Amino acid sequence: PFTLGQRWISDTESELGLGTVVAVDARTVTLLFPSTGENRLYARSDSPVTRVMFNPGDTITSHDGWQMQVEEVKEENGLLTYIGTRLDTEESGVALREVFLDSKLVFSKPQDRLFAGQIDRMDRFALRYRARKYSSEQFRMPYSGLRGQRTSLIPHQLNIAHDVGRRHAPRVLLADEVGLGKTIEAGMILHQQLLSGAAERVLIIVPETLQHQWLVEMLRRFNLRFALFDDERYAEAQHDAYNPFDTEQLVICSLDFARRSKQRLEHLCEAEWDLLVVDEAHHLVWSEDAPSREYQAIEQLAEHVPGVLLLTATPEQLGMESHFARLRLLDPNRFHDFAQFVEEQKNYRPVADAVAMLLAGNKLSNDELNMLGEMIGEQDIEPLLQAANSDSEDAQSARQELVSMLMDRHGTSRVLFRNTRNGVKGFPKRELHTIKLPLPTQYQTAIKVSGIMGARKSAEDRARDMLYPERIYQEFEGDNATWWNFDPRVEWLMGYLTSHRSQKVLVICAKAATALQLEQVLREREGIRAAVFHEGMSIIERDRAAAWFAEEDTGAQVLLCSEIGSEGRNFQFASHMVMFDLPFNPDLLEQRIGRLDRIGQAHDIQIHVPYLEKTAQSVLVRWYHEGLDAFEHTCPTGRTIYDSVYNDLINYLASPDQTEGFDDLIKNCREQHEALKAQLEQGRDRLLEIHSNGGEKAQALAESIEEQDDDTNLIAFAMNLFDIIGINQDDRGDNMIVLTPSDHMLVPDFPGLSEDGITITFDREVALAREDAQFITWEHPLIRNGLDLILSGDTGSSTISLLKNKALPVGTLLVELIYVVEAQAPKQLQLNRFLPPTPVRMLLDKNGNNLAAQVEFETFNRQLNAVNRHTGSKLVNAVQQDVHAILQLGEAQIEKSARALIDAARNEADEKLSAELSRLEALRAVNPNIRDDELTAIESNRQQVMESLDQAGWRLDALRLIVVTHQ
């Protein structure tokens, strides 16, 4: 709704100051910033702009330097006109059009707000002081940026985020096993760099089929709204900007999209990204002599972007050698010769073996132990070397310090994280239950028709038909034929369901059609609550079913899934899974089990597989269980064996009558399975796996965060904030509030709110079951926004209150003073770790003696009550000459107090920031992956902070006058 002449500020670069609308097109608006004279042009969407308006009672300044007194404001044709009294001339009726406001933003001094008759509420003075205190403590939290995410507190994930999220320009390759949290680790790092101010622009490059998955994860899990950029978006933005990608900070797009034109890929590398994220980097095939035409586009990209996140897989049982092609992109100088990397890794292999011997309870030959000595290049290994091997009292500490020293020399573990399911504990066991049902005669006849008509069709598709009797019975008895009346699986299903009504059951089938038919029969014949869950539904629908399914004991008993989506939400309360059918390939099979076989579930998983006798299913049950052991264990051997046996195994599917030769296929498959399993365990880089999951120290970190999650001041603070803002908070009951606006709202529009309301929860476990709700923490944008609205504004800065105390003299003056110590620095410097805006309360007397250390804040405010507007007004002016003399009294004490905070902070800062620089120097002398850039940033940051801290000042933010009465 932009119309020429409106005033706006930049939410980020207010160091640019105020702006003025100077142009408008269909898609864009142009602001002039008179502070510098520069213009910045933005897209209306994502709108990181804040309205600049003033209220009656404010004192404002005109561009000619004179000021005035706000009395009334008109709006016409999208423009505001301020009407009031000119203060320097005492002329009434002066008008100031918003186009003539100054570029300079001044925050009013509360005494001039009190001198001029502005008295705010006494409950808003209370919130303002509480907010600066609460905000201050959370900024300095050691693990900031690791508490707001809607995830389980899994140590191995949290370790990588802490390690990588704190680096400068991080360039890492995430090769975690599938299902371990690559995208979670990715988002945490993103969540971290955005909160610390180190990054503002993020680019995730995703295959188009996965773009929506990433959009919802960053928005619902990490509170990050990415703008999807397609051709349509790209065309309208080329007209609107020099670089189309300057209109949005966070962008998803496809690599196929990225390679369309060269001018497009040039703009991307010139878009000045702080971080880059690339999913499925294994699709990048690279020959030293012949790089693909795609890899050249990334290598052109990877030369223009500081931070680079690579998500990849190392599938088909290959090693980290396949990763060299990508490692080449992070540090092309570090990785410059293939063969040398192979020799090093080959020479490292024996140590992993000997280490694997170590913790298993083995002795290590001296010749063996004299190969580890070459890796760790020192001379005093032996005393530490033998206790770990001699199995003395401290072999645990001799092992842990030995291994620790080994890790600092690993060639990739600093830049490469690959956690396996064997080096990570916490996953639940999976137990099987099989039920053999008699093949009804109606199908026998039904398959012979498909048999005959299956004259000319591949065994690949002939067996795909024999898989699902349901979908040819809808072709020969007409669609919707009542197959649900004689099939014993349904009879077994109900009986099992009606006998376990108090258990949440996950029921997975192939196609959505079968799920919808199943719901009707379970409902209209057993009164069973069953939600259908297919990809065709909207997110709101899937959220709705998760809610119903999450009701502890009053909701849906069953979740009917068809062709399930790929690793969506967590059903931590569900521990039972039923296979109405089994998919063909073993990868999808583990995916079904994947929605439950996750860290953080309630109990172990019980799997029930009712299968029809003598069908393709009966074949797949034994092969999956006896051959691959795919039900109780998760090893991804299935596809290789599935590919190496396909044409033989297929025929037993396309014709389950011929049973001989089968029983030998199974024992042959189990031989391959155990061998492949064995071969993989012996390829384990157990050092990389131990360094990746963070170990025991990480689990300690995980429990510290588990304790910050009981913050009751937050919940109580939040409501206060809200209620003041004027947000109705209906308590639905299950830790969820519905927030709605009001007629008495304080702002035109709040960033997150809609009139239809939003559901919120403060509990991490409820959040994991209801992703449609907001997981409320100290780091959620809602809180920082409302906080900035208050702490930037001057409401709560001036109020009056009376005190009724028999035990004090009449007419005494108490003045509650909230000074604010502040630094002016870009958020990249991270001053808030050591000196965020920190309140300094002071209760001075008529002689300037401070009582605040003795008089707690909350309790004093409790026993206070307000006055009426008129009497209090000039009651202030009775001592207006007195209080001004009271102020300078504190001026001499804050400078003493200020340096106290500053001095302690500079010690704590130089301590941690030098301790990190010393540690990083130790690795650079010992590891080749530490970059020059890394240490320089810390050094520059250490110097700049201590410099910016030597120039910090204080200011009086809030002021409450106290008058004692005995009335």
Side-chain angles (χ1 to χ4, degrees):
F2 296 111
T3 296
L4 252 52
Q6 295 176 330
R7 307 307 291 266
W8 294 73
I9 52 168
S10 166
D11 292 69
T12 298
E13 279 264 342
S14 295
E15 51 246 20
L16 288 178
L18 251 172
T20 305
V21 177
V22 292
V24 278
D25 281 29
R27 305 171 198 80
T28 70
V29 57
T30 306
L31 298 183
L32 165 69
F33 291 96
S35 76
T36 325
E38 161 195 84
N39 299 8
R40 301 291 182 181
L41 168 75
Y42 309 95
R44 278 175 154 166
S45 177
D46 164 57
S47 45
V49 295
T50 297
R51 185 80 164 90
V52 174
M53 300 184 317
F54 296 96
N55 284 90
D58 288 350
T59 299
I60 61 180
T61 305
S62 179
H63 79 295
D64 281 335
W66 54 267
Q67 290 191 2
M68 48 189 296
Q69 182 176 341
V70 180
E71 286 197 28
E72 65 170 313
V73 187
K74 294 183 179 187
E75 168 168 336
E76 276 266 48
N77 300 322
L79 292 181
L80 302 170
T81 302
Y82 300 98
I83 300 156
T85 299
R86 180 170 165 169
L87 301 178
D88 301 66
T89 60
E90 292 173 348
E91 295 186 19
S92 173
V94 172
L96 184 57
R97 292 161 280 183
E98 63 174 317
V99 68
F100 294 125
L101 284 170
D102 264 316
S103 324
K104 300 185 289 300
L105 291 170
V106 291
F107 280 144
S108 191
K109 275 172 91 317
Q111 64 272 99
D112 305 332
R113 295 195 57 259
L114 191 54
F115 287 165
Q118 282 302 116
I119 302 91
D120 315 322
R121 284 178 161 273
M122 204 200 341
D123 51 303
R124 304 199 274 186
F125 183 96
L127 170 77
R128 183 180 181 99
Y129 172 68
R130 294 187 255 244
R132 293 202 163 279
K133 190 169 206 61
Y134 279 114
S135 67
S136 161
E137 301 167 352
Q138 288 299 311
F139 276 119
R140 317 170 193 243
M141 276 301 158
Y143 321 114
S144 197
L146 230 55
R147 306 174 287 154
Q149 70 278 330
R150 193 209 303 273
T151 60
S152 312
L153 299 170
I154 303 154
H156 81 263
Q157 293 172 352
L158 286 176
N159 170 79
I160 303 170
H162 203 287
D163 191 329
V164 183
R166 293 166 94 233
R167 303 182 187 182
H168 160 264
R171 296 173 78 88
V172 164
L173 178 131
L174 303 170
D176 284 48
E177 240 184 46
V178 62
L180 273 292
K182 265 166 298 197
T183 70
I184 287 156
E185 297 148 14
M188 287 138 88
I189 300 163
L190 264 43
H191 191 250
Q192 276 183 124
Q193 299 242 329
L194 286 164
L195 191 49
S196 62
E200 290 173 299
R201 301 181 53 85
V202 186
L203 175 70
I204 309 181
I205 283 184
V206 198
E208 50 268 274
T209 46
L210 291 172
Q211 286 176 350
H212 200 74
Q213 180 206 294
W214 282 81
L215 281 168
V216 163
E217 268 176 354
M218 296 301 102
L219 181 58
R220 280 188 181 178
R221 295 220 272 256
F222 302 96
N223 293 123
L224 295 170
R225 210 183 297 277
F226 281 71
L228 193 75
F229 254 79
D230 55 10
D231 287 70
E232 171 174 7
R233 181 91 177 200
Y234 176 76
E236 56 180 48
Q238 282 173 124
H239 279 65
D240 297 4
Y242 176 31
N243 191 326
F245 300 101
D246 285 349
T247 69
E248 293 294 338
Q249 302 294 301
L250 317 177
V251 169
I252 297 183
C253 68
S254 174
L255 187 52
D256 284 2
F257 167 90
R259 250 173 58 256
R260 217 70 70 78
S261 77
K262 149 63 40 192
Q263 203 179 247
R264 190 179 293 183
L265 190 58
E266 189 164 312
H267 294 150
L268 250 188
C269 300
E270 301 287 89
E272 307 167 71
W273 306 108
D274 297 316
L275 290 184
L276 169 71
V277 183
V278 188
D279 193 3
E280 306 197 312
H282 51 270
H283 293 342
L284 305 157
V285 300
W286 162 89
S287 168
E288 181 183 337
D289 269 313
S292 57
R293 48 164 186 159
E294 259 186 0
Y295 186 98
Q296 290 184 315
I298 293 291
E299 95 182 335
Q300 194 185 141
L301 274 157
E303 287 166 359
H304 292 67
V305 177
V308 175
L309 298 188
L310 273 42
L311 293 80
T312 190
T314 166
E316 75 175 293
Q317 66 210 53
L318 217 56
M320 313 300 94
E321 52 271 8
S322 58
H323 291 135
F324 175 93
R326 301 116 204 169
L327 297 165
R328 205 192 79 89
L329 296 184
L330 307 173
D331 197 355
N333 289 86
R334 153 77 166 95
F335 311 95
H336 57 268
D337 173 284
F338 199 106
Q340 285 191 35
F341 194 80
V342 194
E343 176 74 9
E344 163 184 322
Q345 298 304 321
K346 283 177 292 199
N347 296 330
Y348 161 74
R349 189 72 232 181
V351 178
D353 277 294
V355 168
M357 303 295 152
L358 164 59
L359 311 94
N362 295 5
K363 266 151 206 163
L364 291 198
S365 94
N366 303 96
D367 182 80
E368 289 169 41
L369 289 173
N370 201 74
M371 317 165 72
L372 175 151
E374 298 155 356
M375 163 150 268
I376 170 178
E378 294 266 36
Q379 274 157 348
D380 51 314
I381 306 162
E382 302 298 315
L384 176 57
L385 192 160
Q386 314 283 134
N389 174 45
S390 299
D391 259 307
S392 66
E393 99 282 357
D394 66 294
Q396 186 65 48
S397 188
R399 278 190 297 273
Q400 292 179 310
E401 179 77 310
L402 167 56
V403 59
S404 306
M405 270 152 181
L406 281 140
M407 311 228 276
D408 296 8
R409 292 108 208 287
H410 210 331
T412 44
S413 74
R414 186 128 187 299
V415 71
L416 195 151
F417 293 85
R418 173 154 183 79
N419 303 69
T420 65
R421 286 187 57 107
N422 298 317
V424 177
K425 274 223 65 60
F427 288 92
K429 294 164 203 138
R430 319 191 317 204
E431 187 165 328
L432 183 56
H433 290 261
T434 53
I435 303 91
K436 194 166 168 101
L437 308 171
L439 165 58
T441 50
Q442 296 83 337
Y443 282 142
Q444 284 164 346
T445 72
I447 65 110
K448 262 77 101 188
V449 173
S450 56
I452 303 171
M453 295 307 179
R456 58 133 314 181
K457 250 293 174 158
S458 309
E460 189 169 32
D461 304 309
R462 266 164 47 213
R464 209 208 279 189
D465 308 353
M466 305 301 258
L467 291 173
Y468 315 129
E470 50 257 32
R471 286 215 70 77
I472 51 186
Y473 194 74
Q474 304 188 18
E475 186 62 73
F476 310 147
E477 270 289 70
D479 188 357
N480 298 324
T482 171
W483 65 269
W484 51 85
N485 284 320
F486 53 80
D487 192 311
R489 287 176 294 163
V490 179
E491 244 184 321
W492 185 92
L493 189 52
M494 298 178 177
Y496 174 72
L497 293 178
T498 68
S499 313
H500 296 254
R501 292 198 135 106
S502 197
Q503 302 200 305
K504 294 280 175 277
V505 181
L506 197 58
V507 176
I508 307 174
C509 56
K511 215 66 207 68
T514 306
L516 273 302
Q517 300 185 3
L518 266 170
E519 187 280 307
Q520 194 160 10
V521 170
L522 301 166
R523 151 171 50 93
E524 297 180 339
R525 304 200 194 177
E526 277 284 28
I528 296 176
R529 301 195 199 83
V532 171
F533 201 73
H534 65 91
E535 181 202 308
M537 336 196 344
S538 16
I539 208 50
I540 308 180
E541 303 185 44
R542 296 203 304 274
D543 292 332
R544 215 178 289 151
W548 198 23
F549 185 62
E551 270 184 283
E552 285 79 350
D553 259 308
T554 84
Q557 176 189 3
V558 176
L559 194 69
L560 295 135
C561 313
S562 73
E563 179 44 75
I564 189 62
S566 290
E567 313 325 89
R569 52 201 84 214
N570 293 281
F571 302 118
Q572 293 181 338
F573 50 89
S575 299
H576 294 252
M577 173 176 293
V578 169
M579 302 292 196
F580 199 70
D581 56 65
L582 299 165
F584 193 174
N585 63 100
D587 280 325
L588 309 187
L589 183 273
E590 185 64 46
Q591 274 191 255
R592 295 181 176 186
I593 313 176
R595 301 294 294 247
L596 264 51
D597 176 60
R598 308 186 173 177
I599 301 174
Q601 295 286 129
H603 324 100
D604 297 331
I605 309 304
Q606 304 292 322
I607 302 175
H608 297 274
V609 188
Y611 67 101
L612 296 169
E613 164 183 67
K614 303 311 122 175
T615 186
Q617 293 300 319
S618 100
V619 173
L620 288 176
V621 176
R622 299 188 65 198
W623 188 65
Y624 290 140
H625 187 235
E626 304 173 27
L628 315 182
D629 196 21
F631 286 106
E632 301 188 35
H633 293 350
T634 182
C635 196
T637 58
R639 180 150 278 295
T640 301
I641 306 171
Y642 167 84
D643 302 331
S644 317
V645 157
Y646 195 80
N647 292 125
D648 312 338
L649 196 276
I650 287 268
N651 293 344
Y652 291 88
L653 286 186
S655 80
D657 316 73
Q658 304 296 351
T659 179
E660 220 292 315
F662 185 68
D663 313 80
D664 299 334
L665 204 173
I666 278 63
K667 172 49 86 183
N668 171 227
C669 277
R670 190 54 170 270
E671 284 162 352
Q672 296 190 48
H673 166 74
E674 292 294 346
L676 276 171
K677 192 170 185 291
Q679 189 192 36
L680 293 183
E681 317 191 280
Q682 283 135 1
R684 282 222 278 158
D685 184 336
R686 280 160 163 101
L687 272 175
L688 190 90
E689 288 170 14
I690 289 189
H691 184 220
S692 297
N693 84 137
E696 31 271 49
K697 184 188 72 161
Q699 182 178 333
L701 161 61
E703 299 160 4
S704 311
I705 296 180
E706 279 170 7
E707 216 58 24
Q708 289 171 70
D709 267 6
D710 254 324
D711 206 314
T712 39
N713 317 318
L714 183 271
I715 310 214
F717 178 60
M719 304 206 133
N720 185 2
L721 165 40
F722 293 168
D723 200 59
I724 268 64
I725 300 182
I727 301 174
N728 291 127
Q729 312 176 63
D730 192 313
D731 193 320
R732 297 303 215 250
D734 216 359
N735 276 14
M736 308 188 311
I737 294 92
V738 164
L739 306 178
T740 72
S742 59
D743 52 328
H744 66 269
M745 189 66 89
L746 292 189
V747 152
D749 308 304
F750 198 84
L753 281 198
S754 76
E755 169 66 313
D756 296 332
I758 58 177
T759 319
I760 65 161
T761 174
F762 299 79
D763 183 64
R764 179 179 292 274
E765 207 197 84
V766 176
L768 296 167
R770 287 288 298 271
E771 299 208 338
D772 59 302
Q774 304 300 326
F775 176 39
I776 299 305
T777 60
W778 289 106
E779 316 185 358
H780 188 278
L782 274 194
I783 275 62
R784 289 189 286 149
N785 287 327
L787 268 165
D788 174 80
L789 178 57
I790 309 294
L791 309 185
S792 308
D794 59 61
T795 194
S797 74
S798 59
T799 180
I800 216 169
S801 178
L802 45 75
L803 172 50
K804 300 171 221 65
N805 187 5
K806 295 178 177 178
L808 293 179
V810 279
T812 187
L813 275 188
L814 288 174
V815 184
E816 216 165 15
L817 296 177
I818 309 302
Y819 297 85
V820 168
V821 193
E822 271 165 332
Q824 300 297 318
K827 184 179 278 286
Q828 200 270 3
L829 294 200
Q830 310 183 20
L831 261 290
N832 296 357
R833 302 172 57 190
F834 318 99
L835 191 87
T838 311
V840 176
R841 173 202 158 113
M842 271 158 54
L843 189 55
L844 311 191
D845 74 331
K846 183 144 288 175
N847 317 315
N849 274 258
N850 169 72
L851 294 79
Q854 275 58 52
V855 201
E856 194 251 292
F857 171 74
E858 303 299 331
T859 74
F860 186 65
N861 195 42
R862 292 176 335 193
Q863 62 173 249
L864 267 47
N865 172 23
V867 295
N868 51 35
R869 288 187 230 167
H870 182 46
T871 75
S873 65
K874 289 186 78 161
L875 165 59
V876 190
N877 311 100
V879 291
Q880 177 161 274
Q881 69 287 344
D882 261 319
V883 176
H884 179 78
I886 290 174
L887 291 185
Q888 168 143 333
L889 261 291
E891 168 176 44
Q893 293 184 98
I894 182 54
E895 203 243 23
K896 180 152 204 59
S897 306
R899 276 278 92 83
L901 276 78
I902 274 69
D903 281 51
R906 299 194 67 205
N907 272 30
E908 181 177 278
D910 179 73
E911 174 64 281
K912 288 179 58 176
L913 270 45
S914 299
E916 291 175 351
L917 185 46
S918 292
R919 157 85 165 192
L920 269 195
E921 282 281 44
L923 289 170
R924 166 67 82 86
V926 154
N927 194 282
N929 299 317
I930 285 76
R931 290 148 45 211
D932 291 353
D933 293 49
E934 288 187 287
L935 301 121
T936 300
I938 278 73
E939 248 181 357
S940 300
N941 189 260
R942 185 178 66 182
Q943 179 179 342
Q944 287 179 244
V945 166
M946 268 197 301
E947 287 182 352
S948 285
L949 276 171
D950 278 320
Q951 303 296 345
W954 51 265
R955 71 173 155 94
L956 202 289
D957 172 65
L959 187 160
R960 174 162 72 189
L961 289 197
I962 299 318
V963 172
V964 159
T965 180
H966 314 69
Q967 278 50 49

